[PDB]
Amino acid sequence: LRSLTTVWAEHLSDEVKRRFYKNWYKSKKKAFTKYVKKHSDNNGAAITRELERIKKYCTVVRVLAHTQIRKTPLKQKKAHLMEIQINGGSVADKVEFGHGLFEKPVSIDSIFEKDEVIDVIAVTKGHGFTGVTARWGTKKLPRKTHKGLRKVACIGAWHPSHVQWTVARAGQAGYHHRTSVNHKIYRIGKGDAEDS
Amino acid sequence: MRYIHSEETLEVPENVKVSIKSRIVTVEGPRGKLVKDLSHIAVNFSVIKKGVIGLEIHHGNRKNVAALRTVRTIINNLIIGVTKGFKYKMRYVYAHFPINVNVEKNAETGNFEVEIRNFIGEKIVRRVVMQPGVDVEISKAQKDELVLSGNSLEGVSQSAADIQQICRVRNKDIRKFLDGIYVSEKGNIV
């Protein structure tokens, strides 16, 4: 699959615009400054051409999402941007669905239901450089061992004359990307209700 | 030894239309039309004399000559299928548990589906989907008998064998548990 074209709506908030810098505090914030002329000039004919391209050619359509981290009690001001695939009807329907959603907030209420089984994707908790017993759960060695107990005794036979990839070695544990599946939703609470 | 000429001939009834585009044989008759593909055998077709089709292989090594007679019977089966059709009778055999059967034509696909319940004590349901163009009926003249009809012998015979193969006993002496649906005489419709 190849990304053919990308269409950006005008009036992007600073939460999006911070994702495109490493030093936003001292920058001139020129991101998408010359792009907004596409929406204005020629009655936005440039954007219309790109939308026609997506309908005619593309077979998979995705929207560029955006979090509102300013609404959470986190010190971070960069928003997390994401691509979400519009599964559903025809390609023409997907484009008009996504185009109408430009700059319009989307609530978790519409995406998911109360009794839906979902998959949760996140990066696990980091543990740093950890030994063999922690990474792989190998048996601990007897207390009489001279040069360390939390180790693997035999890391390979004489032949093959190499340490193999299937032998437990100390290193990094945690901070791995994981996709936990088959999680049932129990409640989709409202942020305005006082009896959530 | 290579044979310089091997030949077979096939009588064509006057009420049947036969067409061979390259080696795809299309037979059209009173009961419908059947199409068979034979592009995997090197054979030459010709018209000999007023309604007979000649089949010949020109240099065969006794492994190609063998396929010559096979093609003749397959083509002759197509002619029979569109004139007199094929009808298979299948009888139910059991000792203690009657076999309950229901047949229904799927609306979406169009193929008949045979559903077998109450095999030997079994609670599972055996669903068998017939080949296209095969009709399944439960005979009224004799109790516990299935009737499969169609123009294609391959469709009818394969469908009848699917029913028989799904009714196999497991982990039992099959010489004692002679239970299943077994194919009776293999005549024609007409």
């Binding site: - | 006057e14 049947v16 036969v18 061979i20 077709f45 010709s46 309604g51 089709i53 240099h59």
Partner: protein, 141 residues
Amino acid sequence: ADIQIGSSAWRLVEVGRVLKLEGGSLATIVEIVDHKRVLVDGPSSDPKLAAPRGVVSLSRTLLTPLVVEKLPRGARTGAVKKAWEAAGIDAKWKESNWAKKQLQQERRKALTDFDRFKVMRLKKQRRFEERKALAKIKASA
């Protein structure tokens, strides 16, 4: 009709079939030795189409549409020559498209430097007339 089938009826290898051997000669088949070899005899007055009597492998020959009618099997030279003249095989070969194509190749190979230049000039003049005709057809279409 009753039966409607195509046709791939090859040219048969039969006593009387006229073959084209390598080099351009012709020779009828007087007797079949094997399924790969035949006995031939090209009794043609023209040296180009004349072939000595002998056995030739069928893999080195090309079958022609011309056939000598009802030639007796194993007929010797003279008897074959009488049938060759009676059937007029030499004349029929001349109008055959294979002979015209073969003759065209011989004429092109024989061209000299002056002839190749003259071929250019006469082709350019002929092309100019056809270019005028094609342009008129397209414009009037």
